[PDB]
């Protein structure tokens, strides 16, 4: 989850101001402009920090889920669990931030493609990696990228 709410018994020492931002709970983007277009959409699963595709079908309005390829629609940069809604940056808008990488093979200067699970994998091209993949926890790898569209 984006913010796993767990109670603690001791305070965690947090004084160093470096290597503090690469975390799974840091939503949004590293650099954001006031004129960035944002859309909230109903979602299924957990597409947080992943490429999202718009799925269209009691009939319901279209929702979004993790995906990519020819069906890529945007990027989910923030999520709200109570409302079950996800803030999405459309693919027509450039973005800079940390996204989910398939594995640790991704390095700097690497051109990346959103796979069927919304994860960034090495090689149409969509983004250019800026840093190496870092393991946040278990198999979760986060990579800083500069999304620019589709080739």
């Amino acid at each position: 989850m984006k913010n796993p709410q767990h109670d603690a018994s001791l305070l965690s020492n947090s004084n160093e101001f470096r290597d503090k931002n690469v975390e799974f709970f840091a939503s949004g983007g590293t650099r954001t402009s006031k004129f960035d277009k944002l859309e909230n959409h109903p979602f299924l699963g957990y597409p947080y920090k992943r490429g999202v595709k718009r799925v269209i079908q009691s009939h319901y309005e279209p929702h979004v889920e993790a995906g990519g390829g020819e069906d890529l629609y945007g990027i989910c940069i923030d999520i709200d669990e109570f409302s079950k809604t996800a803030t999405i940056v459309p693919i027509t808008n450039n973005f800079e931030g940390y996204l989910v990488a398939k594995d640790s093979t991704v390095k700097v200067k690497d051109k990346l493609i959103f796979n069927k699970d919304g994860a960034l994998e090495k090689v149409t091209i969509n983004a250019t990696a800026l840093t190496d993949a870092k393991q946040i926890s278990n198999e979760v790898y986060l990579v800083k990228v500069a999304v620019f569209g589709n080739k």
Partner: protein
């Protein structure tokens, strides 16, 4: 040439009596018709990418990335202004459409006419025609024997 403003000074006072054909100067930064809802970025400048297509250029890793004149399959945006003191380049991302005066390749510049599709070369210069949608909206204008500028509209990727 290598500076947005004329490097040398001038020995005359401008007449400032006419209003037609006064925007052909090289120092005319920014777009000709600009929207208030335009996303604008800045980056450290490597070289002089002024009024040229820019691409991401990296280093060993000790320093942050910067932008240099370029194009083709590595095009990232268009540089419209540069602050020389800070060495910062104003960059308009390719996902945001642009309309203004851009540097034109000095090769077949006479053949360029309104309605001619253009594309960016490896040196960030517009050349007559792939993957970037650019349309010339005027004819080439000569500023220096090797410097030609043309009014063009860039509206994304093909």
């Amino acid at each position: 040439a290598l500076m947005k403003n004329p490097q040398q000074d001038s020995g005359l006072l401008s007449n400032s009596i006419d209003f037609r054909d006064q925007n052909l100067i090289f120092s005319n930064s920014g777009g000709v018709c600009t929207s208030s809802k335009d996303k604008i970025e800045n980056y450290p400048a490597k070289g002089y990418p002024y009024k040229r297509g820019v691409k991401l250029s990296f280093g060993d890793g000790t320093t942050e990335l910067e932008v240099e004149a370029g194009g083709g399959d590595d095009l990232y945006g268009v540089c419209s202004d540069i602050d020389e003191f800070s060495g910062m380049a104003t960059v308009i991302p390719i996902t945001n459409n642009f309309t203004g005066y851009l540097t034109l390749k000095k090769d077949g510049q006479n053949g360029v006419n309104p309605g001619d599709k253009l594309n960016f070369n490896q040196h960030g210069e517009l050349e007559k025609v792939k993957s970037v949608n650019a349309i010339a909206l005027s004819k080439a204008h000569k500023l220096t024997e090797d410097l030609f500028i043309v009014l063009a509209s860039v509206f994304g990727n093909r």
